[PDB]
Design an enzyme around this catalytic site. Sequence first.
Site, PDB file in Angstrom:
ATOM      1  N   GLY A 174       0.800  -1.219   0.000  1.00 33.10           N
ATOM      2  CA  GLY A 174       0.000   0.000   0.000  1.00 33.10           C
ATOM      3  C   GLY A 174       0.833   1.270   0.000  1.00 33.10           C
ATOM      4  O   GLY A 174       1.827   1.363  -0.712  1.00 33.10           O
ATOM      5  N   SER A 175       0.418   2.243   0.813  1.00 35.44           N
ATOM      6  CA  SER A 175       1.077   3.548   0.915  1.00 35.44           C
ATOM      7  C   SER A 175       2.573   3.503   1.239  1.00 35.44           C
ATOM      8  O   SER A 175       3.300   4.438   0.892  1.00 35.44           O
ATOM      9  CB  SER A 175       0.372   4.409   1.970  1.00 35.44           C
ATOM     10  OG  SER A 175      -0.984   4.576   1.615  1.00 35.44           O
TER      11      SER A 175
END
Length: 439
Positions: A174-175
């Site tokens: 993800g991020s």
Amino acid sequence: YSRQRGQITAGGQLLAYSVATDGRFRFLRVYPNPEVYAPVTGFYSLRYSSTALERAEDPILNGSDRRLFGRRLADFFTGRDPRGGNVDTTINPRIQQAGWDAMQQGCYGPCKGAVVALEPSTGKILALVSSPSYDPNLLASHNPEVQAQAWQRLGDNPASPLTNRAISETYPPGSTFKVITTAAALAAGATETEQLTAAPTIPLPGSTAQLENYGGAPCGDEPTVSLREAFVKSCNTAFVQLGIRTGADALRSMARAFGLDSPPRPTPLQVAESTVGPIPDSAALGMTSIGQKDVALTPLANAEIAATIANGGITMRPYLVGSLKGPDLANISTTVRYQQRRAVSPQVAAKLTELMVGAEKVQKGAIPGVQIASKTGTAEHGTDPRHTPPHAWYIAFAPAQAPKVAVAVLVENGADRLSATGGALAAPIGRAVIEAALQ
């Protein structure tokens, strides 16, 4: 099981040992802090064999290693009871225990996931935590039915506590993957001050899908924001735009530089290969740039990205075993640190460090007088990513200016809906681990 198997140790403490008993098989294997160190020790079982370091260091521990066979022969001849050799791991018990404890209390109850701590200058694995875990004493039972029932319970347990989540399972980063996207852009000549979209949504090219910023808010109150600002705020649309601009070839290359899509070296535990994915189209590239689509990393690989940056762009080969010794503790082998690869120039490493110092500041469990470089994020997963609670990640190193520890925390389904990134639950777990490392 007739002869005394050797010990697995950490910080001078026993993780696994054998005791002489009245069993037909004389020696009983004992794990005195069993759930905590299961990912490190594994089990040694009469009916199910061995796993993790019991398996990997079997010849040393059982004394059949060629390097030891002078000692066992001497023992037979002399009449003295034989003993296997010892395995001295790199694990720091204080750090392992802090990661474990934090995971057990960190989700208003116990967390599912993993914690990894690495020493960036050496590659020493200082903690390898997986949750939920299991009790290897169960599988070390000499009762066939006790072993078989434990085996069936663990196998049927949908949380799979036998899984070493730190190294055997991959997850969307993800991020946290914006670290790689940023690294690729910086190496291609992007600057921290260049302007990217602040828009709350961005269409994905050649598809009907759009990506939005976490919480659906614009990055700032201006049409655009600096790359630095987008990084610290972790604004999705800016990185979708940046990654597409940087291109699939450059992202693949940077992912590879940071150890993705390369078969990991054994630690001597086998690590699942991490991947950036094939990136078939630009819609996929958009999603890849914020660590979704086909990007999948082990928690160890995410700790390694942080450790690499921490160590000025140089990746040290991670290792779990510091030394092997004989039954009488004479040295057999000592692991030497190895510079595996330069992922990124010292200049890029420093820029990423500064960005990550900024992100950390954007604070539960902060440590007085310790500057932490970090990235916290969430990661969608599964076949219904828009509804299932995303994962929460924290990757970090400290002290930022001369690092001694790097960490990755993955809390499965641990994602937030209120915090700045939505990965907040993972953050204080990381900081407790860093605190333990720096004490």
